[PDB]
């Protein structure tokens, strides 16, 4: 029981002393400002990367569509050829590719929805940092008022 | 010709597999972005303390 009592007193004293030393409004705000900005930059880069990835995915999707057209042309050619095997292969190839394209489109749509949300979130984040900056200006105005009282003593 | 046909069938499958692999890495990348968004939400709570 004695150890527990000692621990609580020591913890409270240590915690109180520690917070006061680091309780500076300008330093804490600057560190916070740097972190959000860094996160925002990373988020912007990520969104750009995601968009780039989506574009790359779109190109692959486009290639699949082109492949289907080539396969479709081959199927028509196969009918002229009269070979049953070539025609059957083309149909099988078209179906898997179409399914893959549909899956890719669904993935792309989800990604598109996600990137749009991220962009909206980024805009909200930009608004938030500006709001924080505004608070500092208000605090600065209050600081000037304190200075004015000192000016009175000089007067 | 038979060997070539088998090889041709195999290479086509590999190409399809490669495309699938490309789709898979992109999906993994998307998950990270979602995780990053969640991380920002945690940051927002901290911003509240600053406010």
The DSSP annotation for A103-126 comes to HHHHHHHHHHHHHHHHHHHHHHHH
Please answer yes or no on whether A39 and B40 come within 8 Å at the CB atom.
yes
CA distances from A53 to A47, A56, A57, A62, A108 (A): 10, 5, 6, 14, 10
Rounded to 10°, the helix A25-81/B2-50 angle is 160
Task: Verify whether the Cβ–Cβ distance A132 to B30 is below 8 Å.
Answer: no
Q: Is A111 exposed, middle or buried (0-12, 13-18, 19+ CB in 10 A)?
A: buried
**Using an 8 Å Cβ cutoff, are A101 and B16 in contact?**
no
Q: 3-state class of A82 per DSSP?
A: coil
DSSP-derived secondary structure letter, B50: H
Q: Which of A32, A104, A125 is facing B40, going by the closest CB pair?
A: A125
Give A145: exposed, middle or buried? Use CB within 10 Å, 0-12, 13-18, 19+: exposed
CB within 8 Å of A36: residues ≥ 6 apart: A125, A128, A129, B43, B47
Could you give the 3-state DSSP secondary structure of residue B28? helix
Which positions ≥6 away from A29 have C-beta within 8 Å?
Answer: A132, A136, B50
Residue A82 CA from chain centroid, whole number: 55
Closest residue of chain B to A24, computed from CA coordinates:
B50
| Experimental determination approach used | cryo-EM
Task: Select from A60, A48, A113 the least CA-distant residue to B21.
Answer: A60
Of A69, A77, A75, A55, nearest to A98 (Cα)?
A69
- Name, in order, each residue with C-beta under 8 angstroms of B29's C-beta and a sequence gap of 6 or more: A49, A50, A53
Report which of B13, B23, B40, B30 is spatially closest to residue A47, judged by C-alpha positions: B30
Q: How many CB atoms lie within 10 A of CB A43?
A: 21
Cβ(A74)–Cβ(A90) below 8 Å: yes
Task: Return d(Cα B13, Cα A86) in angstroms, integer.
Answer: 17
Question: What kind and span of H or E run contains A1?
Answer: none
B42 contact A CB<8A? no
Rounded Cα–Cα distance for residues B30 and B46 (Å): 25
In the block, residue with structure tokens 């792309």:
A108
Is the CB of B5 inside 8 Å of chain A's CB atoms? no
b/e per residue B7-38 (b: at least 16 CB within 10 A): eeeeeeeeebeebeeebeebeeebeebeebbe
For residue A128, the 8-state DSSP code is H
Q: Where are the alpha helices (DSSP H) in B1-51?
A: 2-50
């Amino acid at each position: 029981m004695g150890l527990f009592d000692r621990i609580k007193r020591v913890v409270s004293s240590n915690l109180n002393d520690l917070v006061n030393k680091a309780e500076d409004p300008e330093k804490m705000l600057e560190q916070a400002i740097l972190e959000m900005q860094e996160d925002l930059v990373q988020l912007r880069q990520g969104v750009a990367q995601a968009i780039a990835a989506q574009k790359r995915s779109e190109k692959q999707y486009n290639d699949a569509q082109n492949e289907i057209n080539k396969w479709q042309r081959n199927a028509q050619l196969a009918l002229q050829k009269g070979d049953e095997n070539l025609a059957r292969q083309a149909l099988e190839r078209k179906k898997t590719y179409t399914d893959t394209s549909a899956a890719l489109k669904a993935s792309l749509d989800t990604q598109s929805t996600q990137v749009e949300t991220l962009k909206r979130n980024l805009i909200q984040l930009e608004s938030k940092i500006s709001e924080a900056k505004t608070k500092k200006e208000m605090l600065k105005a209050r600081i000037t008022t304190a200075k004015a009282q000192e000016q009175l003593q000089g007067m």
